[PDB]
Amino acid sequence: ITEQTQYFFDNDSKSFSGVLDCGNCSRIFHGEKLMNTNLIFIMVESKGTRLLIQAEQTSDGPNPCDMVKQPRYRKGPDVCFDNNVLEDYTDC
Amino acid sequence: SDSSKQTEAECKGNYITYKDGEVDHPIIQPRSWENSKFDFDNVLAAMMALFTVSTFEG
Amino acid sequence: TASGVNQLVDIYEKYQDLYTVEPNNARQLVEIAARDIEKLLSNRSKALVRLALEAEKVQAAHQWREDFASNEVVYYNAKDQRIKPVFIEDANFGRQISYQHAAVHIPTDIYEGSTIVLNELNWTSALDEVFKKNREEDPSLLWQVFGSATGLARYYPASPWVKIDLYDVRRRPWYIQGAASPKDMLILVDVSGSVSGLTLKLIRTSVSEMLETLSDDDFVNVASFNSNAQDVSCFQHLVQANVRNKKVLKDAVNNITAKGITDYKKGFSFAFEQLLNYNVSRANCNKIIMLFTDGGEERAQEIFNKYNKDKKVRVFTFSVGQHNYDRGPIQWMACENKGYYYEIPSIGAIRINTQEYLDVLGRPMVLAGDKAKQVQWTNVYLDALELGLVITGTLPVFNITGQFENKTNLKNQLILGVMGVDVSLEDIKRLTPRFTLCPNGYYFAIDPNGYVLLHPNLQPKPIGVGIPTINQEPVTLDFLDAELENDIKVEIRNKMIDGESGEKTFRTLVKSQDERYIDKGNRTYTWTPVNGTDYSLALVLPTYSFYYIKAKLEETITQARYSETLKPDNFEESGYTFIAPRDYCNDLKISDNNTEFLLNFNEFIDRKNADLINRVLLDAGFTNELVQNYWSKQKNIKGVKARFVVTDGGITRVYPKEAGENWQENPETYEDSFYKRSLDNDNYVFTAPYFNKSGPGAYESGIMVSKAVEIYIQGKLLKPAVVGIKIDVNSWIENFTKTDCVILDDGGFLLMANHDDYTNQIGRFFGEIDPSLMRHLVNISVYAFNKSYDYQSVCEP
Ligand SMILES: *[C@@H]1O[C@H](CO)[C@@H](O)[C@H](O)[C@H]1NC(C)=O
Ligand SMILES: *[C@@H]1O[C@H](CO)[C@@H](O)[C@H](O)[C@H]1NC(C)=O
Ligand SMILES: *[C@@H]1O[C@H](CO)[C@@H](O)[C@H](O)[C@H]1NC(C)=O
Ligand SMILES: *[C@@H]1O[C@H](CO)[C@@H](O)[C@H](O)[C@H]1NC(C)=O
Ligand SMILES: *[C@@H]1O[C@H](CO)[C@@H](O)[C@H](O)[C@H]1NC(C)=O
Ligand SMILES: *[C@@H]1O[C@H](CO)[C@@H](O)[C@H](O)[C@H]1NC(C)=O
Ligand SMILES: *[C@@H]1O[C@H](CO)[C@@H](O)[C@H](O)[C@H]1NC(C)=O
Ligand SMILES: *[C@@H]1O[C@H](CO)[C@@H](O)[C@H](O)[C@H]1NC(C)=O
Ligand SMILES: *[C@@H]1O[C@H](CO)[C@@H](O)[C@H](O)[C@H]1NC(C)=O
């Protein structure tokens, strides 16, 4: 079971800016989306931790111990021929 | 040879035996209605069979 | 300017003729597809019905010979008086076929010439006539199997069996489907001090095998009593015995230990308590409690009188292992209740015993005259004969010996066996033509359980469970796990399962074909139930795919110039050209090399589904017109490494004729990630090439761009084709440098970064470069993510 991940733009706003506080340091970034095109332009400051991996990596599926509490809707068959009086119980 | 067939008529053909008891790695093998090494079929066969017992071997 | 979207718009518009935009009503299409699939399933049901009638009637008069040394039965044993068959390399099934007799497959651990087996061979030998009757009255029927309840398997198209043969029809899912109705299992593993050693190994192996003999529509749980009835797993109730839950139960069973003192009374009380948890969505029918133990000395009479007074629940009991403990209590416990007592002396006897309780569970349905002869389609599962994905229809054949004599004192309460027919998903897929829809549209249908059937994201390979470990289950993909799941799609799934017919529209996110992008679009769902059986065929159409263009040609002269328009020798002046592997009549179907497919198509058109080929030829003509008019004019623009145009029908054209050698896009247009994505959006889409690919790219291929060619023929939005270009990396590096600057796209893929080292590693997912930048960026309402799951994937460990 691979756990794929994808990223996409959320807000229609174009301009973005702020500060980065990795550690005992500061950085400046300013974002801007190329209008009428699927692109974003950002200007990070020169180098001065934990790698994000968008590549699918092997992982266990959702914990089944938790999904069985609220199972997905299910409509089983409605015949299940059982419990007939004319049955022989002499076999053992 | 297979322990789940208590007669010659049902003891024929191949059967699946598992190496060293592991459920995986089956091995095909034939069925043989083989007699014991020493058996009491005859009086003569019994005498030799009992002789080894007197020797504390087998 | 390079691709010239508006230029193609004008080219399409000026030739208003050759267009007749019929509307995909989205309701009549689903209706007719449902009708056709229902008709196919009913055809298979009729074949099953007649086969079952013939088999029962033949069995009614057998006389039970007992000396077959004379008048030997003649049959073709698959694992090669035997027959010598002459095989025809039939391409329908992908393997050797005979069509002149039904093969047989006696499981390796069953004696070939036993008295009971030979009789089955003899009385089934008359079934080949009806097999041939069915295969002749209508072709395209894959298999007819008679899974007799002795291990035999008489499948009509005789092919050699596909290395130790462990196959056993009595355990296959399509057999258990008809052998007995659903169940409510509860395995009472006896992990007590008396079962330490080999007995515990046998118990664990037998429990795992049993869980392997449970369909995906019956529930199960695994308790254990050692003077205290705990639960080996995390569930504490019945958990549907799914593909996943089976794995959890198997692991929990494997990790158990013998300890303490046995206490049957407390364990059975716990068990009977668990089966009365009616508020957990139980499959409230065929309750069972299958105790495993070495040997008892206390029969829980008081418990069996407190609960189970009316004999509602069945109780099977296994005396696993070799020992000398008393077995009277266990036999009596099985006998009083409507159960049956077994024994598992050692490994090898597990496979033949754990599957026998289905014979007992089938007694009520056998005693039911004809209410039980209902065709019961299974869920998608890989065929045992390497055929693909096949759903098997099943219909039990009962034992009618002495009928109409009213003897009613015989073993007429056990089925002869389940005997099914196979339908291949590749066969259903041709009843739902995808080519009339846009690349985004598709069909899909779901079991009542929700498991998909004929879904585009269902790939023919086993569904994964858990992480692999250092050193046959059906392919069941829940509908929410085959796509991105939200609060809206769940309502659609719930409504389809109930059979309600209705139409819904909304805006949702679609996981692109490359599993590396997500986009927002409208998807007008539509669903309906196929009244013949329990299914819900759906249909997904974006708002822009309501109308489609279909070509009408009668001059036959323009057809010619279109026919030689896509010749291999015109590439030098018309750009390279691909053709999608579509079913243009019986024309050869290509697998890997598109060049020979193009040549075969050229030969076929030279010689002479007519609408589809007409559309392909029209698209070829229009693309040739565009390229020759313009792309032949402004050849080799400064920063345009190559130019490509993709349409529907399968026409993909690349101008330079040299970028084709570096064109990794699949020839089929409906499988091109950028094409579907480019349609999804309404603006130019940039595709970052993969990184660290064994093949070439990212410097000699260039980044890709695309833009759907929107059209208004008569006021209807249409996006038949996409025109794109592969910008050379160096030229636009020069541009960007002329002006730490990073150019990025949704999905965090570095198109460039000013630093030379970064642009050296162009195309790598930005995030392995400056992770903190995005870690903050995701926090400010940009670059969200959806951590979905892909259950069908391959790993190295
Ligand atoms: C199914 O249900 C009813 C038939 O009575 C009708 O509304 C619908 O068109 C039917 N469609 C199919 C495919 O059976
Ligand atoms: C169903 O069987 C009939 C009779 O052979 C045949 O004419 C019809 O085409 C079949 N339907 C399908 C969908 O194959
Ligand atoms: C059973 O065997 C006999 C003798 O070989 C044969 O005549 C008969 O046809 C067989 N039964 C059927 C149904 O063919
Ligand atoms: C096995 O079960 C015991 C029960 O206490 C637990 O301690 C142990 O961690 C389990 N081991 C594995 C590998 O699950
Ligand atoms: C379900 O049944 C169990 C056992 O009787 C009980 O403990 C529990 O409260 C019930 N829950 C609901 C929601 O009915
Ligand atoms: C069918 O039932 C009869 C009842 O006497 C039995 O003799 C026969 O063996 C059964 N069928 C098979 C294949 O055993
Ligand atoms: C590409 O992957 C291989 C995997 O073995 C690795 O050895 C190599 O260093 C990688 N190179 C780049 C540029 O990512
Ligand atoms: C990210 O967002 C979370 C939730 O709003 C917040 O707790 C956290 O401080 C933010 N910053 C980082 C670096 O996670
Ligand atoms: C995907 O992520 C967005 C933003 O975090 C969220 O609104 C949406 O519900 C998510 N959908 C799924 C299927 O994860």
Short mmCIF file of N, CA, C and O in Angstrom, two decimals, chain A residues 1-11 19-20 29 37-44 47 50-54 58 60-62 64-65 68 72-75 77 80-84 86-89 91-92, chain C residues 181 217 234 244-245 248 285 314 335 340 363 367 371 448-449 464 466 478 481 493-494 498 511 515 677 684 686 740 742 744 746-747 758 765 767-768 771-772 775 781-788 790 793 795:
data_model
loop_
_atom_site.label_atom_id
_atom_site.label_comp_id
_atom_site.label_asym_id
_atom_site.label_seq_id
_atom_site.Cartn_x
_atom_site.Cartn_y
_atom_site.Cartn_z
N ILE A 1 0.86 -1.18 0.00
CA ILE A 1 0.00 0.00 0.00
C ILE A 1 0.90 1.23 0.00
O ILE A 1 1.56 1.53 0.99
N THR A 2 0.91 1.95 -1.11
CA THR A 2 1.63 3.21 -1.21
C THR A 2 0.71 4.36 -0.80
O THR A 2 -0.48 4.36 -1.09
N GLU A 3 1.30 5.35 -0.12
CA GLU A 3 0.57 6.49 0.41
C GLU A 3 0.96 7.71 -0.41
O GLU A 3 1.87 8.46 -0.05
N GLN A 4 0.26 7.91 -1.52
CA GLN A 4 0.58 9.00 -2.43
C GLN A 4 0.16 10.34 -1.84
O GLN A 4 -0.74 10.42 -0.99
N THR A 5 0.82 11.40 -2.30
CA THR A 5 0.52 12.75 -1.86
C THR A 5 0.63 13.70 -3.04
O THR A 5 1.50 13.54 -3.90
N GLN A 6 -0.27 14.68 -3.09
CA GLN A 6 -0.25 15.70 -4.13
C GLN A 6 -0.56 17.05 -3.51
O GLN A 6 -1.22 17.14 -2.47
N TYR A 7 -0.09 18.11 -4.16
CA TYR A 7 -0.28 19.47 -3.69
C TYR A 7 -0.91 20.31 -4.79
O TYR A 7 -0.65 20.10 -5.98
N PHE A 8 -1.73 21.27 -4.39
CA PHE A 8 -2.43 22.13 -5.33
C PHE A 8 -2.68 23.48 -4.69
O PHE A 8 -2.69 23.62 -3.47
N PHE A 9 -2.90 24.48 -5.54
CA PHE A 9 -3.18 25.83 -5.06
C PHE A 9 -4.53 25.86 -4.35
O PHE A 9 -5.50 25.25 -4.80
N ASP A 10 -4.58 26.59 -3.24
CA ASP A 10 -5.79 26.69 -2.42
C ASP A 10 -6.54 28.00 -2.65
O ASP A 10 -7.72 27.99 -3.02
N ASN A 11 -5.87 29.13 -2.45
CA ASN A 11 -6.50 30.44 -2.53
C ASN A 11 -6.26 31.06 -3.90
O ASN A 11 -5.18 30.91 -4.48
N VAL A 19 8.06 35.61 6.60
CA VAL A 19 9.40 35.35 7.11
C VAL A 19 9.51 33.87 7.46
O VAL A 19 8.53 33.23 7.84
N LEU A 20 10.72 33.34 7.33
CA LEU A 20 11.02 31.96 7.68
C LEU A 20 11.97 31.95 8.88
O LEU A 20 12.94 32.70 8.92
N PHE A 29 10.67 35.77 1.76
CA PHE A 29 10.09 35.16 0.57
C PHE A 29 8.90 35.99 0.12
O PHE A 29 8.15 36.50 0.95
N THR A 37 -2.06 30.99 -15.94
CA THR A 37 -1.05 29.95 -16.08
C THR A 37 -0.87 29.27 -14.73
O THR A 37 -0.95 29.92 -13.69
N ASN A 38 -0.62 27.97 -14.77
CA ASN A 38 -0.43 27.18 -13.56
C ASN A 38 1.04 27.23 -13.14
O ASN A 38 1.82 26.29 -13.32
N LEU A 39 1.42 28.37 -12.57
CA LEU A 39 2.78 28.58 -12.09
C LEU A 39 2.77 29.56 -10.93
O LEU A 39 1.90 30.43 -10.83
N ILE A 40 3.75 29.40 -10.04
CA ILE A 40 3.95 30.29 -8.90
C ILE A 40 5.42 30.68 -8.88
O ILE A 40 6.30 29.84 -9.09
N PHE A 41 5.69 31.96 -8.62
CA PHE A 41 7.05 32.49 -8.57
C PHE A 41 7.35 32.94 -7.14
O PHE A 41 6.61 33.75 -6.57
N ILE A 42 8.42 32.40 -6.57
CA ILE A 42 8.84 32.73 -5.21
C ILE A 42 10.33 33.02 -5.21
O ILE A 42 11.10 32.45 -6.00
N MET A 43 10.74 33.90 -4.30
CA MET A 43 12.14 34.32 -4.17
C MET A 43 12.58 34.06 -2.73
O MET A 43 12.30 34.86 -1.83
N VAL A 44 13.28 32.95 -2.52
CA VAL A 44 13.82 32.63 -1.21
C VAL A 44 15.19 33.29 -1.06
O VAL A 44 15.83 33.67 -2.05
N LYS A 47 20.95 30.20 1.34
CA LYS A 47 21.00 29.27 2.46
C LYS A 47 21.78 29.88 3.62
O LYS A 47 22.85 30.47 3.43
N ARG A 50 13.77 18.76 7.98
CA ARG A 50 13.02 17.55 7.65
C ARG A 50 12.57 17.66 6.20
O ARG A 50 11.87 18.62 5.83
N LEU A 51 12.94 16.68 5.38
CA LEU A 51 12.66 16.73 3.96
C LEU A 51 11.22 16.31 3.69
O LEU A 51 10.77 15.25 4.14
N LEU A 52 10.49 17.15 2.95
CA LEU A 52 9.17 16.77 2.45
C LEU A 52 9.33 15.86 1.25
O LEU A 52 10.11 16.14 0.34
N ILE A 53 8.59 14.75 1.25
CA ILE A 53 8.66 13.76 0.18
C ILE A 53 7.27 13.64 -0.42
O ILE A 53 6.37 13.05 0.19
N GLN A 54 7.09 14.18 -1.63
CA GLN A 54 5.86 13.97 -2.37
C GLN A 54 5.84 12.62 -3.07
O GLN A 54 4.77 12.16 -3.49
N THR A 58 6.10 3.42 0.71
CA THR A 58 5.38 2.29 1.27
C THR A 58 4.95 2.60 2.70
O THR A 58 5.72 3.14 3.50
N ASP A 60 1.69 1.27 5.82
CA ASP A 60 0.51 0.50 6.16
C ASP A 60 -0.75 1.34 5.93
O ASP A 60 -0.75 2.56 6.10
N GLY A 61 -1.82 0.66 5.52
CA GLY A 61 -3.08 1.33 5.27
C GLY A 61 -3.66 1.90 6.54
O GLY A 61 -3.02 1.90 7.60
N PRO A 62 -4.88 2.43 6.47
CA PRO A 62 -5.52 2.95 7.67
C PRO A 62 -5.65 1.87 8.73
O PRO A 62 -5.92 0.71 8.43
N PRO A 64 -6.97 -0.65 10.73
CA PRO A 64 -8.29 -1.30 10.71
C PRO A 64 -8.94 -1.37 12.08
O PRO A 64 -10.17 -1.46 12.15
N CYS A 65 -8.17 -1.32 13.16
CA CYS A 65 -8.76 -1.31 14.49
C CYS A 65 -9.68 -0.11 14.70
O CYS A 65 -10.55 -0.15 15.57
N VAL A 68 -13.26 -0.23 11.76
CA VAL A 68 -14.37 -1.14 12.02
C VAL A 68 -15.39 -0.54 12.97
O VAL A 68 -16.54 -0.99 13.01
N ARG A 72 -18.11 1.41 6.63
CA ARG A 72 -18.81 2.00 5.50
C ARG A 72 -20.15 1.31 5.29
O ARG A 72 -20.32 0.14 5.62
N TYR A 73 -21.10 2.05 4.73
CA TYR A 73 -22.43 1.50 4.51
C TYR A 73 -22.35 0.25 3.64
O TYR A 73 -21.60 0.21 2.66
N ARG A 74 -23.13 -0.76 4.00
CA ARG A 74 -23.08 -2.05 3.32
C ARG A 74 -24.45 -2.69 3.39
O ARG A 74 -25.05 -2.76 4.46
N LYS A 75 -24.94 -3.16 2.25
CA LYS A 75 -26.24 -3.82 2.14
C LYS A 75 -26.01 -5.23 1.62
O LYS A 75 -25.85 -5.44 0.42
N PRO A 77 -26.69 -9.51 1.12
CA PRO A 77 -27.77 -10.29 0.52
C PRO A 77 -28.83 -10.64 1.55
O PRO A 77 -28.58 -10.69 2.76
N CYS A 80 -30.02 -16.02 2.33
CA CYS A 80 -29.35 -16.77 3.39
C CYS A 80 -30.17 -17.96 3.90
O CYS A 80 -30.48 -18.06 5.09
N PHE A 81 -30.49 -18.90 3.01
CA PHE A 81 -31.33 -20.04 3.38
C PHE A 81 -30.66 -20.82 4.50
O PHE A 81 -29.60 -21.43 4.31
N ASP A 82 -31.28 -20.80 5.68
CA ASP A 82 -30.79 -21.56 6.83
C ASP A 82 -31.96 -21.85 7.76
O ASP A 82 -33.06 -21.32 7.59
N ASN A 83 -31.70 -22.70 8.75
CA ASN A 83 -32.68 -23.03 9.79
C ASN A 83 -33.95 -23.63 9.18
O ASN A 83 -35.04 -23.05 9.23
N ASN A 84 -33.77 -24.80 8.59
CA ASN A 84 -34.88 -25.60 8.07
C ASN A 84 -35.15 -26.76 9.01
O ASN A 84 -34.22 -27.49 9.38
N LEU A 86 -36.74 -29.57 8.57
CA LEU A 86 -36.53 -30.88 7.96
C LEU A 86 -35.04 -31.08 7.66
O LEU A 86 -34.61 -31.21 6.52
N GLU A 87 -34.26 -31.11 8.73
CA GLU A 87 -32.82 -31.30 8.65
C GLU A 87 -32.42 -32.46 9.54
O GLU A 87 -33.03 -32.70 10.59
N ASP A 88 -31.39 -33.19 9.12
CA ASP A 88 -30.90 -34.36 9.84
C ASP A 88 -29.69 -33.97 10.67
O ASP A 88 -28.71 -33.45 10.14
N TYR A 89 -29.77 -34.23 11.98
CA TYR A 89 -28.68 -33.95 12.91
C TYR A 89 -27.97 -35.22 13.36
O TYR A 89 -27.42 -35.27 14.46
N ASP A 91 -25.31 -36.51 11.92
CA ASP A 91 -23.93 -36.49 11.48
C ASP A 91 -23.05 -35.83 12.55
O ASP A 91 -23.39 -34.76 13.06
N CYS A 92 -21.94 -36.47 12.87
CA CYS A 92 -21.02 -35.97 13.88
C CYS A 92 -19.65 -36.62 13.75
O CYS A 92 -19.52 -37.71 13.19
N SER C 181 -24.62 -20.23 2.19
CA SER C 181 -24.99 -18.83 2.32
C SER C 181 -23.97 -18.11 3.21
O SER C 181 -23.08 -18.75 3.77
N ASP C 217 -18.21 -11.27 2.21
CA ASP C 217 -19.58 -10.87 2.53
C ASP C 217 -20.09 -11.55 3.79
O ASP C 217 -21.29 -11.45 4.10
N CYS C 234 -7.75 -6.61 18.00
CA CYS C 234 -8.20 -5.32 18.49
C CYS C 234 -9.67 -5.05 18.23
O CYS C 234 -10.15 -3.95 18.52
N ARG C 244 -8.51 -6.94 4.34
CA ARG C 244 -7.64 -6.39 5.38
C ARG C 244 -7.87 -7.09 6.71
O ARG C 244 -6.92 -7.59 7.33
N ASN C 245 -9.12 -7.13 7.18
CA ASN C 245 -9.40 -7.70 8.49
C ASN C 245 -8.87 -9.12 8.61
O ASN C 245 -8.40 -9.53 9.67
N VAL C 248 -5.32 -8.89 9.77
CA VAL C 248 -5.19 -8.58 11.19
C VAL C 248 -5.45 -9.82 12.02
O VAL C 248 -4.71 -10.14 12.96
N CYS C 285 -27.49 -13.96 9.98
CA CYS C 285 -27.93 -15.23 9.42
C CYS C 285 -26.77 -16.22 9.38
O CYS C 285 -25.62 -15.83 9.14
N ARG C 314 -25.01 -22.83 15.24
CA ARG C 314 -24.33 -24.08 14.93
C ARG C 314 -23.00 -24.11 15.67
O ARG C 314 -22.43 -23.06 16.00
N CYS C 335 -22.62 -32.66 18.29
CA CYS C 335 -23.79 -33.44 17.89
C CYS C 335 -25.08 -32.82 18.39
O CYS C 335 -26.06 -32.72 17.65
N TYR C 340 -21.14 -30.38 13.46
CA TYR C 340 -20.44 -31.54 12.94
C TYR C 340 -19.02 -31.52 13.50
O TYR C 340 -18.41 -30.46 13.59
N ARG C 363 -27.04 -27.70 3.97
CA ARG C 363 -28.20 -28.57 4.14
C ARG C 363 -29.52 -27.81 4.02
O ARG C 363 -30.41 -28.27 3.28
N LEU C 367 -32.38 -28.64 1.18
CA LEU C 367 -33.73 -29.02 1.55
C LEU C 367 -34.75 -28.04 0.98
O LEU C 367 -35.90 -28.42 0.74
N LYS C 371 -35.85 -22.55 -4.32
CA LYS C 371 -35.58 -21.17 -3.93
C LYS C 371 -34.09 -20.88 -3.85
O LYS C 371 -33.71 -19.70 -3.82
N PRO C 448 -23.00 -4.60 -4.16
CA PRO C 448 -23.73 -4.05 -3.01
C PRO C 448 -22.81 -3.69 -1.86
O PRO C 448 -23.08 -2.72 -1.14
N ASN C 449 -21.72 -4.44 -1.69
CA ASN C 449 -20.73 -4.12 -0.67
C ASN C 449 -19.97 -2.84 -0.96
O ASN C 449 -19.26 -2.34 -0.08
N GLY C 464 -2.96 -4.86 -2.20
CA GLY C 464 -1.98 -4.98 -1.14
C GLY C 464 -2.60 -4.93 0.24
O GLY C 464 -3.62 -4.28 0.47
N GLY C 466 -1.07 -4.38 4.21
CA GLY C 466 0.07 -4.12 5.08
C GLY C 466 1.37 -3.94 4.33
O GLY C 466 1.42 -4.09 3.11
N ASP C 478 -12.65 -0.84 -2.67
CA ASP C 478 -13.82 -0.07 -2.27
C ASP C 478 -13.90 1.21 -3.09
O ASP C 478 -12.88 1.83 -3.40
N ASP C 481 -11.95 4.12 -2.10
CA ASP C 481 -10.51 3.94 -2.17
C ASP C 481 -9.98 3.92 -3.60
O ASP C 481 -8.76 3.92 -3.79
N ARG C 493 -22.18 6.94 -3.13
CA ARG C 493 -21.95 5.52 -2.92
C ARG C 493 -23.09 4.88 -2.14
O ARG C 493 -23.57 3.80 -2.50
N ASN C 494 -23.54 5.54 -1.07
CA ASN C 494 -24.63 4.99 -0.28
C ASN C 494 -25.90 4.87 -1.11
O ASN C 494 -26.62 3.87 -1.01
N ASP C 498 -28.13 1.18 -2.46
CA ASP C 498 -29.55 0.95 -2.25
C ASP C 498 -30.33 0.84 -3.55
O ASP C 498 -31.52 0.49 -3.51
N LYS C 511 -7.62 13.01 -8.93
CA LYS C 511 -6.21 12.64 -8.89
C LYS C 511 -5.76 12.32 -10.31
O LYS C 511 -6.19 11.33 -10.90
N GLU C 515 -0.58 10.55 -10.77
CA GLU C 515 -0.50 10.51 -9.31
C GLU C 515 0.46 11.57 -8.79
O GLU C 515 1.17 11.36 -7.80
N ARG C 677 -5.58 16.41 -17.75
CA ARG C 677 -5.35 17.58 -16.91
C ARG C 677 -5.56 18.87 -17.69
O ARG C 677 -6.22 19.80 -17.22
N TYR C 684 -2.92 27.46 -19.44
CA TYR C 684 -1.74 26.69 -19.78
C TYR C 684 -1.26 25.91 -18.56
O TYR C 684 -1.19 26.43 -17.45
N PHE C 686 1.79 23.47 -16.98
CA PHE C 686 3.20 23.10 -17.08
C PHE C 686 3.42 21.76 -16.40
O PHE C 686 2.99 21.56 -15.26
N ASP C 740 17.73 34.39 -4.37
CA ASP C 740 17.45 33.06 -4.91
C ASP C 740 16.05 33.02 -5.52
O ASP C 740 15.06 32.93 -4.80
N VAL C 742 13.10 31.29 -7.67
CA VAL C 742 12.62 29.94 -7.93
C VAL C 742 11.30 30.02 -8.66
O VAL C 742 10.36 30.66 -8.19
N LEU C 744 8.12 27.80 -9.82
CA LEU C 744 7.52 26.60 -9.25
C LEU C 744 6.08 26.47 -9.75
O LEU C 744 5.47 27.45 -10.19
N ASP C 746 2.19 24.07 -9.07
CA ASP C 746 1.44 23.26 -8.11
C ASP C 746 1.96 21.83 -8.13
O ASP C 746 2.11 21.23 -9.20
N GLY C 747 2.23 21.30 -6.95
CA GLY C 747 2.95 20.05 -6.81
C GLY C 747 4.41 20.21 -6.45
O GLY C 747 5.09 19.21 -6.25
N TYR C 758 20.56 23.95 -8.37
CA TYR C 758 19.15 23.58 -8.33
C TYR C 758 18.63 23.27 -9.73
O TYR C 758 18.03 22.22 -9.96
N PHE C 765 10.95 17.05 -7.18
CA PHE C 765 9.91 17.67 -6.38
C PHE C 765 10.53 18.65 -5.39
O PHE C 765 11.22 18.24 -4.46
N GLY C 767 10.99 20.39 -2.28
CA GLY C 767 10.60 19.84 -1.00
C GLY C 767 11.70 18.95 -0.46
O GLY C 767 11.85 18.80 0.76
N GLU C 768 12.48 18.36 -1.36
CA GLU C 768 13.76 17.76 -1.03
C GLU C 768 14.90 18.77 -1.14
O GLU C 768 16.07 18.38 -1.09
N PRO C 771 12.98 22.27 2.39
CA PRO C 771 11.73 21.78 2.99
C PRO C 771 11.04 22.80 3.88
O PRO C 771 9.81 22.89 3.87
N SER C 772 11.81 23.58 4.65
CA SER C 772 11.19 24.53 5.57
C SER C 772 10.38 25.58 4.82
O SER C 772 9.34 26.03 5.32
N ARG C 775 7.13 23.91 4.29
CA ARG C 775 6.54 23.61 5.59
C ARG C 775 5.88 24.84 6.17
O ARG C 775 4.83 24.75 6.82
N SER C 781 -2.28 28.82 3.85
CA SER C 781 -3.44 28.66 2.97
C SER C 781 -3.04 28.54 1.50
O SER C 781 -3.77 28.98 0.62
N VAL C 782 -1.87 27.96 1.24
CA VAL C 782 -1.43 27.66 -0.12
C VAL C 782 -0.65 26.36 -0.08
O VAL C 782 0.07 26.07 0.88
N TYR C 783 -0.80 25.56 -1.14
CA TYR C 783 -0.25 24.20 -1.19
C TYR C 783 -0.82 23.33 -0.07
O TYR C 783 -0.12 22.88 0.84
N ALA C 784 -2.13 23.11 -0.15
CA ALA C 784 -2.75 22.07 0.65
C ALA C 784 -2.33 20.70 0.10
O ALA C 784 -1.54 20.60 -0.85
N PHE C 785 -2.85 19.64 0.70
CA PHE C 785 -2.50 18.30 0.26
C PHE C 785 -3.61 17.34 0.65
O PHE C 785 -4.37 17.60 1.58
N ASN C 786 -3.70 16.24 -0.09
CA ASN C 786 -4.65 15.17 0.18
C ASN C 786 -3.89 13.85 0.21
O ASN C 786 -3.51 13.33 -0.84
N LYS C 787 -3.68 13.32 1.41
CA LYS C 787 -2.85 12.14 1.60
C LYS C 787 -3.68 10.88 1.35
O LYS C 787 -4.08 10.16 2.26
N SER C 788 -3.93 10.62 0.07
CA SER C 788 -4.73 9.49 -0.34
C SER C 788 -3.90 8.21 -0.29
O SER C 788 -2.70 8.22 -0.01
N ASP C 790 -3.05 4.33 -2.30
CA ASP C 790 -3.06 3.54 -3.52
C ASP C 790 -2.81 2.09 -3.13
O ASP C 790 -1.67 1.71 -2.85
N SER C 793 0.12 -1.43 -5.64
CA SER C 793 1.46 -0.93 -5.90
C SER C 793 2.45 -2.04 -5.56
O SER C 793 2.12 -3.01 -4.88
N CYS C 795 6.41 -3.08 -4.17
CA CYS C 795 7.51 -2.67 -3.31
C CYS C 795 8.63 -3.69 -3.42
O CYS C 795 8.42 -4.85 -3.78
#
